[PDB]
């Protein structure tokens, strides 16, 4: 089997991606935050806080035919932002773009933190990192992907993410039209639950590639490029009058400047993301300070390869018996 699903922008910044997913009989259909930096598929529904609730489609599993409550079984996430959410778990059918999984965990939230609130295009995530994160208790749960993995033609799903547009997940195959030249591909630790893998040095604009091991994951679900402090100096020093402000928290640069590229290497290959995939806006509205999409992850404790890198390229999630990662240009 495979899937194909189309995954648009929530904002005129790129700072999410929704794809559509039918959870139930009859189908409800809810628009999720695929997240390759997460394992937990988790929604607003019929249980969340109404006060909780601001504009989200919710799932609600007593009018789902095919919806079992998992006795006993809660879940309790916090990710890298500060946000969170919990609540108990459902088994039902999940389909995403034409593939079906059935008895999925869908996590049912009963609580969500303001973030969550506030972003009404956003009914819940589709976590798509090593079932070894997901968060539910007792019995912990399978991601839609490792449920569907002995099904699909290929042990895969690749991320074609769009800068300001949409783009594409599929499931099961590799579409040899959607990337240019060919892919390379490079290895995986699994250790920590992500798609970890190893950069092999940077370049800034039109400089010479500095040859260095990054070490980061493949994070969708995160909006920008989270490199070593060394590294993100190095990319802001060729942008006049940038520099890291403590106040608005992080790297902010003149909304008058033109960015410069910035390239990241895979293996021998070479991915270059366009300055202008680097411009977040202006910081508040009406501001001439535009914040960067090159941050530190100095006090992340780890590198990110989030959307502004990976919308740079098309991205194969390699999920075979020693799982690899794959990077084309497009």
Do not use: M
């Not at 960015?259 to 366009?274: D, E, K, Q």
């Amino acid at each position: 089997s495979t899937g194909s699903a189309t995954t648009t922008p929530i904002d005129s910044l790129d700072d999410a991606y929704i794809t559509p997913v039918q959870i139930g009989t009859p189908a409800q259909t809810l628009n999720l935050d695929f997240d390759t930096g997460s394992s937990d598929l988790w929604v607003f529904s019929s249980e969340t806080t109404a006060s909780e609730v601001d504009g989200q489609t919710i799932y609600t599993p007593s009018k789902s035919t095919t919806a079992k409550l998992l006795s006993g079984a809660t879940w309790s996430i916090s990710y890298g932002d500060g946000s969170s959410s919990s609540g108990d778990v459902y088994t039902d059918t999940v389909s995403v773009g034409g593939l079906t999984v059935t008895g999925q965990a869908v996590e049912s939230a009963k609580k969500v933190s303001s973030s969550f609130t506030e972003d009404s295009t956003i009914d819940g995530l589709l976590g798509l990192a090593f079932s070894t994160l997901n968060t539910v208790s007792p019995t912990q749960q399978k991601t839609f992907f490792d449920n569907a993995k002995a099904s699909l033609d290929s042990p895969v799903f690749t991320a074609d993410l769009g800068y300001h547009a949409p783009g594409t997940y599929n499931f099961g195959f590799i579409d040899t039209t959607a990337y240019t030249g060919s892919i390379t591909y490079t290895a995986v630790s699994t250790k920590q639950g992500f798609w970890e893998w190893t950069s092999t040095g940077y370049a800034v604009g039109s400089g010479t590639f500095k040859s260095t091991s990054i070490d980061g994951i493949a994070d969708t679900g995160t909006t920008l490029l989270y490199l070593p402090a060394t590294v993100v100096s190095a990319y802001w020093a060729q942008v006049s009058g940038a520099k890291s402000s403590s106040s608005v928290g992080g790297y902010v640069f003149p909304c008058s400047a033109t960015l410069p590229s910035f390239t990241f290497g895979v293996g021998s290959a070479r991915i270059v993301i366009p300055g202008d995939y680097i411009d977040f806006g202006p910081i508040s509205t009406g501001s001439s300070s535009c914040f960067g999409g090159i941050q530190s992850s100095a006090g992340i404790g780890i590198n990110i390869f989030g959307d502004v890198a990976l919308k740079a390229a098309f991205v194969v999630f390699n999920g075979a018996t020693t799982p690899t990662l794959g990077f084309a240009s497009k």
